[PDB]
Amino acid sequence: HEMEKEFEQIDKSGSWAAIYQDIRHEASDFPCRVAKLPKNKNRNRYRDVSPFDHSRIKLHQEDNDYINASLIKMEEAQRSYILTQGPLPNTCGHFWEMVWEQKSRGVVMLNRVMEKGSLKCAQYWPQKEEKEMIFEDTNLKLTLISEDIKSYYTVRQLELENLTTQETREILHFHYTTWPDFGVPESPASFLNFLFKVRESGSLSPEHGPVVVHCSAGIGRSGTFCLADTCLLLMDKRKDPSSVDIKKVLLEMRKFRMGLIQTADQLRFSYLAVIEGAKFIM
Ligand SMILES: [Mg+2]
């Protein structure tokens, strides 16, 4: 591989910081007028992280249609993802309305609810079978049916019911529970095993709505997930897999949501995950 020796070169020169700065400078800037309306102030977890108007997900019920979520439609890779912030105590109803309305089958969570003793996401799913959640604003019920708890991630079977129609769906909740408190994983092996399990589930199939991916702001770890998955798809489809340019792919993604990949260490980690995943995509 070359991005393999190309990885070596960037490591060698200590230019991750510079390459990452270049991405920030080159990234698209589109308007986020709706996210910034006064009435949406309490629907944003971070004032500095907003969906662009052109790609935001719109809620369908008769109220206010806004949720901080973006559709990332990766044209060449042929896969779409919704990236969204960790829901707030007042937007869990909206979050599950989005999953229903967009026909998602999987939700991918990349943080723990509390990290370093600080809350990063509301408890937006039920931890106990007998204590289901009812979101009275959006008329949805959510029940934990089972979970498969593993050392580095947990997969939950959730039943989401539209209480208006009594229709139900099974939603798979893929929760990577072991991202470090500071920095990125030393090795991408667990992250890749996690991604491959999400893939294996069918949750990323074009038969279903886009997978919902989140972390706390929905741009950093979430960025890393969608970037690695898309690069690996492009290296599998493209006539010559060495032509896939991770910085170009990330700029393409950032036409859909700002800020994806939040640090130079995250950008390095994405490269490393894609290089290692490729060996596995053998
Ligand atoms: Mg119990």
CSV table of N, CA, C and O in Angstrom, one decimal, residues 10-54:
chain,number,residue,atom,x,y,z
A,10,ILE,N,3.9,10.8,6.8
A,10,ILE,CA,3.3,11.9,7.6
A,10,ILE,C,3.7,11.7,9.0
A,10,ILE,O,4.0,12.7,9.7
A,11,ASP,N,3.8,10.4,9.5
A,11,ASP,CA,4.2,10.2,10.8
A,11,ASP,C,5.7,10.7,11.0
A,11,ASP,O,6.0,11.5,11.8
A,12,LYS,N,6.5,10.2,10.1
A,12,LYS,CA,7.9,10.6,9.9
A,12,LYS,C,8.1,12.2,10.1
A,12,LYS,O,9.0,12.6,10.9
A,13,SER,N,7.3,13.0,9.4
A,13,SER,CA,7.5,14.4,9.3
A,13,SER,C,6.8,15.2,10.4
A,13,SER,O,6.9,16.4,10.5
A,14,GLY,N,5.9,14.5,11.2
A,14,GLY,CA,5.1,15.1,12.2
A,14,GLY,C,4.2,16.2,11.6
A,14,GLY,O,3.9,17.2,12.3
A,15,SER,N,3.6,15.9,10.4
A,15,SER,CA,2.7,16.9,9.8
A,15,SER,C,1.2,16.6,10.0
A,15,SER,O,0.4,17.1,9.2
A,16,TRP,N,0.9,15.7,10.9
A,16,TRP,CA,-0.6,15.5,11.1
A,16,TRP,C,-1.3,16.8,11.4
A,16,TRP,O,-2.4,17.1,10.9
A,17,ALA,N,-0.7,17.6,12.3
A,17,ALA,CA,-1.3,18.9,12.7
A,17,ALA,C,-1.5,19.8,11.5
A,17,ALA,O,-2.5,20.4,11.3
A,18,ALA,N,-0.5,19.8,10.6
A,18,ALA,CA,-0.6,20.7,9.4
A,18,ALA,C,-1.7,20.2,8.4
A,18,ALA,O,-2.6,20.9,7.9
A,19,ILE,N,-1.7,18.9,8.1
A,19,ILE,CA,-2.7,18.3,7.2
A,19,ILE,C,-4.1,18.6,7.7
A,19,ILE,O,-5.0,18.9,7.0
A,20,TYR,N,-4.2,18.4,9.1
A,20,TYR,CA,-5.5,18.6,9.7
A,20,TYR,C,-5.9,20.1,9.6
A,20,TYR,O,-7.0,20.5,9.3
A,21,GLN,N,-4.9,21.0,9.8
A,21,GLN,CA,-5.2,22.4,9.7
A,21,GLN,C,-5.7,22.8,8.3
A,21,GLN,O,-6.5,23.7,8.2
A,22,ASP,N,-5.2,22.1,7.4
A,22,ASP,CA,-5.5,22.4,5.9
A,22,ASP,C,-6.9,22.0,5.7
A,22,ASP,O,-7.7,22.6,5.0
A,23,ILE,N,-7.3,20.8,6.3
A,23,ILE,CA,-8.7,20.4,6.1
A,23,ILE,C,-9.6,21.4,6.7
A,23,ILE,O,-10.7,21.8,6.2
A,24,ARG,N,-9.3,21.9,7.9
A,24,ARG,CA,-10.2,22.9,8.5
A,24,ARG,C,-10.4,24.1,7.7
A,24,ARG,O,-11.5,24.6,7.5
A,25,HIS,N,-9.3,24.6,7.1
A,25,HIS,CA,-9.2,25.8,6.3
A,25,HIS,C,-10.0,25.6,5.0
A,25,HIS,O,-10.8,26.4,4.5
A,26,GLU,N,-9.9,24.4,4.4
A,26,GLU,CA,-10.6,24.0,3.1
A,26,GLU,C,-12.0,23.6,3.2
A,26,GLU,O,-12.7,23.6,2.2
A,27,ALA,N,-12.5,23.3,4.4
A,27,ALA,CA,-13.8,22.8,4.6
A,27,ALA,C,-14.9,23.7,4.2
A,27,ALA,O,-14.7,25.0,4.2
A,28,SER,N,-16.0,23.2,3.7
A,28,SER,CA,-17.1,24.0,3.2
A,28,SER,C,-17.7,24.8,4.4
A,28,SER,O,-17.6,24.4,5.6
A,29,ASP,N,-18.3,25.9,4.0
A,29,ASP,CA,-19.0,26.8,5.0
A,29,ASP,C,-20.4,27.0,4.3
A,29,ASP,O,-20.5,27.6,3.2
A,30,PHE,N,-21.4,26.4,4.9
A,30,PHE,CA,-22.8,26.7,4.4
A,30,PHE,C,-23.6,27.3,5.6
A,30,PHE,O,-23.2,27.0,6.8
A,31,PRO,N,-24.7,27.9,5.3
A,31,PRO,CA,-25.6,28.4,6.4
A,31,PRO,C,-26.2,27.4,7.2
A,31,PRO,O,-26.6,26.3,6.8
A,32,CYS,N,-26.3,27.8,8.5
A,32,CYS,CA,-27.1,27.0,9.5
A,32,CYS,C,-28.1,27.9,10.1
A,32,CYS,O,-28.2,28.1,11.4
A,33,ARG,N,-28.9,28.6,9.3
A,33,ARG,CA,-29.9,29.6,9.8
A,33,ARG,C,-30.9,28.9,10.7
A,33,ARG,O,-31.3,29.5,11.7
A,34,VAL,N,-31.5,27.7,10.4
A,34,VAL,CA,-32.5,27.2,11.2
A,34,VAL,C,-31.9,26.8,12.6
A,34,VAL,O,-32.6,27.1,13.7
A,35,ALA,N,-30.8,26.2,12.7
A,35,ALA,CA,-30.1,25.7,13.9
A,35,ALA,C,-30.0,27.0,14.8
A,35,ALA,O,-30.0,26.8,16.0
A,36,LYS,N,-29.7,28.1,14.2
A,36,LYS,CA,-29.4,29.3,15.0
A,36,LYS,C,-30.6,30.2,15.4
A,36,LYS,O,-30.5,31.2,16.2
A,37,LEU,N,-31.8,29.8,15.0
A,37,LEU,CA,-33.0,30.5,15.4
A,37,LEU,C,-33.2,30.5,16.9
A,37,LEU,O,-32.9,29.4,17.6
A,38,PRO,N,-33.6,31.6,17.5
A,38,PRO,CA,-33.8,31.6,19.0
A,38,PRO,C,-34.6,30.5,19.5
A,38,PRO,O,-34.3,29.9,20.6
A,39,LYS,N,-35.7,30.0,18.7
A,39,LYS,CA,-36.5,29.0,19.3
A,39,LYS,C,-35.8,27.6,19.3
A,39,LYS,O,-36.3,26.7,20.0
A,40,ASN,N,-34.7,27.5,18.7
A,40,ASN,CA,-33.9,26.2,18.7
A,40,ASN,C,-32.7,26.1,19.7
A,40,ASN,O,-32.1,25.1,19.7
A,41,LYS,N,-32.6,27.2,20.5
A,41,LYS,CA,-31.5,27.3,21.4
A,41,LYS,C,-31.4,26.1,22.3
A,41,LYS,O,-30.2,25.5,22.5
A,42,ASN,N,-32.5,25.6,22.9
A,42,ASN,CA,-32.4,24.5,23.7
A,42,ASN,C,-32.4,23.1,23.0
A,42,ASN,O,-32.4,22.1,23.7
A,43,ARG,N,-32.4,23.0,21.7
A,43,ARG,CA,-32.2,21.8,20.9
A,43,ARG,C,-30.7,21.5,20.5
A,43,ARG,O,-30.5,20.4,19.8
A,44,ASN,N,-29.8,22.4,20.8
A,44,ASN,CA,-28.4,22.2,20.5
A,44,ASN,C,-27.6,22.0,21.7
A,44,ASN,O,-27.7,22.9,22.7
A,45,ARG,N,-26.8,20.9,21.7
A,45,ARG,CA,-26.0,20.6,22.9
A,45,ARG,C,-24.8,21.5,22.9
A,45,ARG,O,-24.4,22.0,24.0
A,46,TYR,N,-24.2,21.9,21.7
A,46,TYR,CA,-23.0,22.8,21.7
A,46,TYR,C,-23.3,23.9,20.7
A,46,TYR,O,-23.7,23.7,19.5
A,47,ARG,N,-23.2,25.1,21.1
A,47,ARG,CA,-23.5,26.3,20.3
A,47,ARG,C,-22.6,26.3,19.1
A,47,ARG,O,-22.9,26.9,18.1
A,48,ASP,N,-21.5,25.6,19.2
A,48,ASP,CA,-20.5,25.7,18.1
A,48,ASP,C,-20.7,24.6,17.1
A,48,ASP,O,-19.9,24.6,16.1
A,49,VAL,N,-21.6,23.7,17.3
A,49,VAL,CA,-21.8,22.6,16.4
A,49,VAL,C,-23.3,22.5,15.9
A,49,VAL,O,-24.2,22.2,16.7
A,50,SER,N,-23.5,22.9,14.6
A,50,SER,CA,-24.8,23.0,14.0
A,50,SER,C,-24.9,22.3,12.7
A,50,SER,O,-23.9,22.2,12.0
A,51,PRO,N,-26.1,21.8,12.4
A,51,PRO,CA,-26.2,21.2,11.1
A,51,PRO,C,-26.4,22.3,10.0
A,51,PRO,O,-27.1,23.4,10.3
A,52,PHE,N,-25.9,22.1,8.9
A,52,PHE,CA,-26.2,23.0,7.7
A,52,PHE,C,-27.7,22.9,7.3
A,52,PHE,O,-28.3,21.8,7.4
A,53,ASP,N,-28.3,24.0,6.9
A,53,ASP,CA,-29.7,24.0,6.5
A,53,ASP,C,-29.8,23.1,5.4
A,53,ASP,O,-30.9,22.3,5.3
A,54,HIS,N,-28.8,23.0,4.5
A,54,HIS,CA,-29.2,22.1,3.2
A,54,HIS,C,-29.3,20.6,3.5
A,54,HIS,O,-30.0,19.9,2.8
